[PDB]
Design an enzyme around this catalytic site. Sequence first.
Site, PDB file in Angstrom:
ATOM      1  N   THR A 123       0.401  -7.906   6.148  1.00  0.00           N
ATOM      2  CA  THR A 123       0.092  -9.222   5.585  1.00  0.00           C
ATOM      3  C   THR A 123       1.360 -10.037   5.327  1.00  0.00           C
ATOM      4  O   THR A 123       1.518 -11.145   5.856  1.00  0.00           O
ATOM      5  CB  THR A 123      -0.730  -9.068   4.300  1.00  0.00           C
ATOM      6  OG1 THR A 123      -0.070  -8.154   3.421  1.00  0.00           O
ATOM      7  CG2 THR A 123      -2.124  -8.537   4.611  1.00  0.00           C
ATOM      8  N   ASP A 213      10.065  -1.476  10.267  1.00  0.00           N
ATOM      9  CA  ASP A 213       9.574  -1.534   8.897  1.00  0.00           C
ATOM     10  C   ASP A 213       9.612  -0.105   8.365  1.00  0.00           C
ATOM     11  O   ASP A 213       8.782   0.734   8.738  1.00  0.00           O
ATOM     12  CB  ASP A 213       8.177  -2.141   8.818  1.00  0.00           C
ATOM     13  CG  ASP A 213       7.730  -2.379   7.389  1.00  0.00           C
ATOM     14  OD1 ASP A 213       8.135  -1.615   6.488  1.00  0.00           O
ATOM     15  OD2 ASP A 213       6.967  -3.340   7.171  1.00  0.00           O
TER      16      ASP A 213
HETATM   17  C1  LIG Z   1       2.241  -3.674  -1.365  1.00  0.00           C
HETATM   18  C2  LIG Z   1       1.912  -2.997  -0.281  1.00  0.00           C
HETATM   19  N1  LIG Z   1       2.706  -3.063   0.838  1.00  0.00           N
HETATM   20  C3  LIG Z   1       3.883  -3.538   0.870  1.00  0.00           C
HETATM   21  C4  LIG Z   1       4.497  -3.519   2.153  1.00  0.00           C
HETATM   22  C5  LIG Z   1       5.493  -4.396   2.435  1.00  0.00           C
HETATM   23  C6  LIG Z   1       6.047  -5.403   1.449  1.00  0.00           C
HETATM   24  O1  LIG Z   1       6.810  -4.816   0.549  1.00  0.00           O
HETATM   25  P1  LIG Z   1       6.959  -5.365  -0.979  1.00  0.00           P
HETATM   26  O2  LIG Z   1       5.590  -5.165  -1.524  1.00  0.00           O
HETATM   27  O3  LIG Z   1       7.979  -4.428  -1.432  1.00  0.00           O
HETATM   28  O4  LIG Z   1       7.384  -6.756  -0.823  1.00  0.00           O
HETATM   29  C7  LIG Z   1       6.045  -4.339   3.709  1.00  0.00           C
HETATM   30  N2  LIG Z   1       5.675  -3.517   4.658  1.00  0.00           N
HETATM   31  C8  LIG Z   1       4.699  -2.667   4.376  1.00  0.00           C
HETATM   32  C9  LIG Z   1       4.293  -1.762   5.423  1.00  0.00           C
HETATM   33  C10 LIG Z   1       4.095  -2.636   3.144  1.00  0.00           C
HETATM   34  O5  LIG Z   1       3.138  -1.753   3.013  1.00  0.00           O
HETATM   35  C11 LIG Z   1       0.684  -2.179  -0.193  1.00  0.00           C
HETATM   36  O6  LIG Z   1       0.386  -1.741   0.911  1.00  0.00           O
HETATM   37  O7  LIG Z   1       0.026  -1.990  -1.228  1.00  0.00           O
END
Ligand SMILES: C=C(/N=C/c1c(COP(=O)(O)O)cnc(C)c1O)C(=O)O
EC number: 4.1.99.2
Lengths: 455, 455, 455, 455
Positions: A123, A213
Amino acid sequence: NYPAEPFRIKSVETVSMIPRDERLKKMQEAGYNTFLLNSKDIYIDLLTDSGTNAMSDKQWAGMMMGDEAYAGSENFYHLERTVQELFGFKHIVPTHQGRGAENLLSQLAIKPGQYVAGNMYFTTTRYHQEKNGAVFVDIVRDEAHDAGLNIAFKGDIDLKKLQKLIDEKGAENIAYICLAVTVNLAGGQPVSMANMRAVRELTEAHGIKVFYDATRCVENAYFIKEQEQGFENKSIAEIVHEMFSYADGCTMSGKKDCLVNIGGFLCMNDDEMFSSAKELVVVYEGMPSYGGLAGRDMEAMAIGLREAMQYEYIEHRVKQVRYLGDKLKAAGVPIVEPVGGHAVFLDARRFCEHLTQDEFPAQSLAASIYVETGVRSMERGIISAGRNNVTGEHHRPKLETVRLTIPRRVYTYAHMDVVADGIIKLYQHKEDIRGLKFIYEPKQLRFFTARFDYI
Amino acid sequence: NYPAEPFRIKSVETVSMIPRDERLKKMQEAGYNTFLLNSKDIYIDLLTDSGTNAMSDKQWAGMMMGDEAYAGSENFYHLERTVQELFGFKHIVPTHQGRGAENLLSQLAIKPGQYVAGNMYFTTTRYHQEKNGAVFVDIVRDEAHDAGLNIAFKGDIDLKKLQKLIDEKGAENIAYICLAVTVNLAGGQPVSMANMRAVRELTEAHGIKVFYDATRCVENAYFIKEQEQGFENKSIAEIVHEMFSYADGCTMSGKKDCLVNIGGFLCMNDDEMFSSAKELVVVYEGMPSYGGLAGRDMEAMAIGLREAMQYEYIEHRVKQVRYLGDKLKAAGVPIVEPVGGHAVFLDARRFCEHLTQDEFPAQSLAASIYVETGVRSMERGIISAGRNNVTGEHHRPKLETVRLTIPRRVYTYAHMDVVADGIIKLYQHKEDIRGLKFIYEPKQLRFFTARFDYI
Amino acid sequence: NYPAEPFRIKSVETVSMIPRDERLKKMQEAGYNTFLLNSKDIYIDLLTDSGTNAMSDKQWAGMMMGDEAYAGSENFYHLERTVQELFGFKHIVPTHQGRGAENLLSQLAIKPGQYVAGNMYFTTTRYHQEKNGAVFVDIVRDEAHDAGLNIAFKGDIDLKKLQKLIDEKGAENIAYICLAVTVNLAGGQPVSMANMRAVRELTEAHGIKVFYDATRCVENAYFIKEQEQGFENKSIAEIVHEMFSYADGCTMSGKKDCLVNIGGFLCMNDDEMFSSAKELVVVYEGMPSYGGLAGRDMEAMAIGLREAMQYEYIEHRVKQVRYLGDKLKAAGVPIVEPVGGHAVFLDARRFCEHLTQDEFPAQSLAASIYVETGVRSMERGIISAGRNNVTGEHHRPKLETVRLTIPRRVYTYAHMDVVADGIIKLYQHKEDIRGLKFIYEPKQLRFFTARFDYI
Amino acid sequence: NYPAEPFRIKSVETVSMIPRDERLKKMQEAGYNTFLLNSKDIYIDLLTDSGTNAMSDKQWAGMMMGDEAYAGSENFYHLERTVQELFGFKHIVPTHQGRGAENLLSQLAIKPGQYVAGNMYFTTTRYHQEKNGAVFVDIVRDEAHDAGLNIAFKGDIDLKKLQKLIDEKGAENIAYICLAVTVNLAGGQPVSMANMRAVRELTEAHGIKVFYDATRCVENAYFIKEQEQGFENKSIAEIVHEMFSYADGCTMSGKKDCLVNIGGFLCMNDDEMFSSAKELVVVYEGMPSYGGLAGRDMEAMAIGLREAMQYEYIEHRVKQVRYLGDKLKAAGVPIVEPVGGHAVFLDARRFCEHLTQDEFPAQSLAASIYVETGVRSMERGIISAGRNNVTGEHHRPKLETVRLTIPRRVYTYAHMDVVADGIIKLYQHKEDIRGLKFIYEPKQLRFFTARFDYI
Ligand SMILES: C=C(/N=C/c1c(COP(=O)(O)O)cnc(C)c1O)C(=O)O
Ligand SMILES: C=C(/N=C/c1c(COP(=O)(O)O)cnc(C)c1O)C(=O)O
Ligand SMILES: C=C(/N=C/c1c(COP(=O)(O)O)cnc(C)c1O)C(=O)O
Ligand SMILES: C=C(/N=C/c1c(COP(=O)(O)O)cnc(C)c1O)C(=O)O
Ligand SMILES: [K+]
Ligand SMILES: [K+]
Ligand SMILES: [K+]
Ligand SMILES: [K+]
């Protein structure tokens, strides 16, 4: 099998459950969006593994030795040295969390109208790519979009899809390849080392850059150790180091596999890109010497990233998730398979067969799990997928899922049993779950604060 | 039915996870004496439930608010208020742990030649009674000495034995009744409220004082709630308060049921004794308002005692111990019965029935348990019983046991499985366990530093 | 000169002063004994440097790594190794604080009717010596009892007095020599290395043991470095190590120069004494592996003892005290000279010339400083000196003093200025201070909780 | 009159105390750029007051009670309640620090081509205004640009300049008034309440919005209490609340006056803008209920903002800075006047009047200050001004200064003496200070990594 926790409990926080009648009031007060419920009204909080981890005694010792200096903090040098050693990249820029690093990369590496191709979208990543003028192209293999198909390394990029992209668009119109490990929205599915090698070989022959990532790279390394032929006697750290040797840089949310509550960073090998990154971090995050983090948090992240390399830690982490999936599968509850590294994804299409995806069954199922169990889970389906920025229609993902996301080192198998038992009972009367419709929709990342009503 | 943990993990304690062959080398370097193992070499440390507890986030917040003043610390007044409210005694004096309070009570309450009668004894408690001139008398019910007898409230005082003592020696020659809750030496067995009231009634008619050894009084209160008719509608706090309404004072080790790592106190209702206690505490412990504790530790103990009153916490504490006992008993492993509030006792005499007591079966079983699982347990048999230094012969206890002592809020049911599975596996080839012989034996405290080799 | 603090402030606690009218109520509620005032009603708390110190970030990091194991804690091994390295003694037994170690030594080393000789008495030390049947003999040189006499190394033992004791009583009737560094009740006065050498040489020729009171040994080492010819280029650690090379063991309250809030230990070289000490510690303190301390406190004490060796730290510590003395002396306020390592002692006989010592002027002056400034100080005169245990009369010390005791790393020079200014103003109307008489007197260590009234 | 610290030291931060000759080697290894020094080599670090503050024991207790939930954390609700109570804005969105809130405000409140007018500017604030299409206009009173003019409330907006802007460009073309308290670029100069009300009155009649840059609003409030007629009977809290009653919102860096090491937030009264801000915060920072902060940090900031309202705290904070300025001015050292709330600015143009600006007098003075005292200060002159990359020539600021920036609650008056005495000693032979030349100059952010050598 299912190993016991390879650590002891050092300190605790109390949990409690409020009556069903009061949870029912809370859920409608939250407009039936689980993001809008209050932490104190949650009994077991599986909304996300992001920033919710339990730190160790060694990390808390580091928290007492925060060097809060604006430049030249010992904590920065420790973090920088730890990432150079474990990931192998030349340069590091700390950020307050992962989407801060995504903000920097997308502004540095995208010319408007170029393509960014990755193994399934995420997202915040996709928002920053499109905000800076890129077109996202999904090059994950088709199987990753079929929830029930149990095959290994579902996160792998389809090399034929990548090749077709280079041929139809030309390499100079591709800003970079975005390779995520693991792949979150496919269910936490891993990428093989063979796939990372092949992606590196093909992109390098065309001068295309590859950025990882890295957010759940240690979970991904565990799957390689467990299941990829030839890696069975390599250490988790050796696997992690080899993984990033096929990349030009990475974005990282330390809030996942670095075992912390806040923090992230951006890595790269190119000197000019590092120079531009330092100019830009000052605008959004802070000086390149702390990047929007307190010194004590750079310290905890440096310590946590090294703790994450312990085999027994990551084995237990992944097998605890697997335990929850195995108990749900043994009862017939439909889930995404194979179980991924960080969460079990209930298949909301099979759980709510009586609903169409336009009735938002995943969002509806999450509300129902809260009302019947007090467990919080997250929507990972049509709501999260957003709208097409050309037509205005729902993106329609095949995966309409509800995520039971496991914070690291927080819960026990007995907690997993409580979760499983509550979901198995809800399964018995799954026909009682109603469709939902928007009453308030944000113009981007709408899933965070959208409000719904029953149809 | 075994409840899930009524808390989640806030922070973890690191352990090393060394394999069997390395554990064997550690055990040999320790001379096959678990008391000589290094903590850093132990995965699951069940040596004692004393001072090994995990504190909550609220207690650790209190640790940051230590008022370290020598006199009049706010933390003392918080501890004083809490104990007066929950236990109901008029006056309280802090001590650094339980045997500090015992030292004070025995000097205050014993004239030489007098008798002190108790429901069995604990080693430090009885030492301070005898050091100050008392003759100890056991007045526990006879059933407490049958380790295989599965009956409730085994710690109860035999009212007939108390009456016989009063008639044979005279009330004026009895210093006090020492009533322990629970009774450690019987395996952690509880005392009923009916028994406490009967003792109070009988002693009060003769002017005899009753002081409680309150160290595991919360575990005791849970047994009353679970098993004594009429207390199903009472809170843990209501039961605790009524318990101490039948006493003139108590000695308390906070290192057990107050959920801390250090700390204790002395309570009493008599103003005169309180005045004398304050004159004495400065000799051995410190001021009446810190008693050998840091301010932050009086604070942690005030918070922890109040946390111990939560029903779900103490129900889970006792049922986690019960889980371990039930699992062992289901596989045929011989244990003391019923399982107590804080520990499971293996019967090493029956476990190692191919070994004589002079071959130290409990000491050898405890060594084998560590080697196979990484679990440390305590010898409670002939080695701990010591040697008669006049005659040179062993003290030979009827009970030859290994104590699996469970710290509060530190381990999970999965850790209990590691312990049980390992012991059950050992039991299935119990005839392979070898006897031990002394290679170094000190003159006193021999269980602490003695070293052994295999026969 | 007066150096700035060789550290930064990491965290703070708020101070406040309540109106004079309310302090007046507090002081009479405390029976005019400053020990009975509440910490929250104190503005600057100079009652004692014992356990009131500010710890460092490194010590608080160690507080997060408490290994709370009952035996074999990493924290115990760290403390043991640190004391062996820095003090040079063969064996160590931890105790919860200094009077716990004094309790052990006095029981181990005194036969009833023997003499113990030291450089001036101290309250808890003398109580444990007499309680175990010894007669205390003061062998400090006469000058140490004259407050105004400014000479170096006032703590030194008079070798002629020691020699006379050996001749009149015989060496076998002397249990040991008690050599304290610094000497608290003479004003924190240091002992020279030459004196420790000579005491060692003379006692060793008669087979008499020497045990140090090590409580402020680092302050004492600073005075040696500053003022004893030949030591100007030796490190504080080298001086400390050489000091204890002239002793057979020591008692230590870590609450002073180990920079902690709780903790102490007993050191000795003799193997049989160490064996007896371990048997006895179990009765009063705890197992020899923790001695009544949490693991995290053994860790903080090990770290603090090593921090205390930093020259700039101890130089500032001592010169900050000296600053307060110099400001009071420049205004004509009568003090004990030279200023000692840990406190300034107001000469209450010169401050309250209109009072006889039987009117307790020191106790009265302390009450008055609180009422006029909200600063808490301690009586160090006829009240503290106790009664003669043969005649029942007041011990009558020449030093009738009020102690402004400086906790380590807690206050600034601006705080010293506030204290000095308030005392200078009280000096102007010193004739307003009234005599006091007992209304409640404890039977030992009476100064802790005695209550007084104005004559 | 300079007050004593209204707190005492709870814990200290270690420093190394290296001597002059070693400091010289560190400065040369840093290429004579204080920004390149290692924190571990610095005794007194006056580089910035941002994020370098010492927290209280109460804040550190809050750090142990972080509710790390992704949504609905109790710590957010505590922060929200506190800001609504003390500042009085309807809505609040947390951000990881101040420039995060500026990013949000400028995207929410600026249409391209519009004007933003302020009382001078700060570099990050104005960047985000210009990045989003605004044209900046300075409307500060002309006196603010006279660094030697000793007058009160130098930060006040010139109401005439505001009126001229409105008449010349039209109200509909002004996005907002950016009113900063205090005004960093004038040396930390305060704004009067009368000025805030006049600006609010004038803007409100044209429908123009006013947003405060509130970063040092508590220092500002102390100046109002000290120097504006009519506010002598108002509490700091009453003044703060009235200040923000004249604004439509604010951006806040908690790293300054909220007494924390990380953290900020955005406030506003308009519901619609609040809704839009919540849609945007998830792009860059995080959820509306954590905004890129750990739960424990929202908690520390809620506690710290309330602590900042204590009159004695902020009086001492400002008067400690004033003490340093007064001492320098008394010795003839040229400084910006009046001294501001957070820093003393040396006038390096006059200090080093034997040096031209192309020899970087401020950069060289800052290097000399470190070598002579161990004090780090910040260059705020030609180096920081950067280079015009079109023409290649230096940006040449009228102000050539060295900033001695004082973190809150970290240093004492004795540390201020070290700083002053060293600078006064340098000033007495100021003609010996040598000019500097570039040996490495990066293309951007040159003050961060440029290296120099002596001419
Ligand atoms: C907050 C979530 N994800 C963050 C996330 C992010 C963004 O990270 P921050 O929430 O640390 O901004 C980037 N890439 C992946 C694969 C991620 O899963 C979650 O999946 O709940
Ligand atoms: C240390 C243990 N017992 C402590 C204890 C004590 C002495 O408490 P301290 O260890 O806190 O002195 C007193 N009474 C009972 C019944 C006890 O169980 C143990 O069982 O390992
Ligand atoms: C409490 C104080 N003294 C303790 C002390 C002690 C007793 O230590 P504990 O307070 O740690 O028991 C022993 N020896 C000396 C020289 C001491 O000064 C004091 O002087 O305030
Ligand atoms: C970092 C500094 N200034 C921060 C600042 C900021 C930006 O705040 P953050 O550093 O929290 O982004 C905004 N406005 C003003 C007036 C400021 O002074 C400094 O002066 O060193
Ligand atoms: K910081
Ligand atoms: K203390
Ligand atoms: K402990
Ligand atoms: K978090």
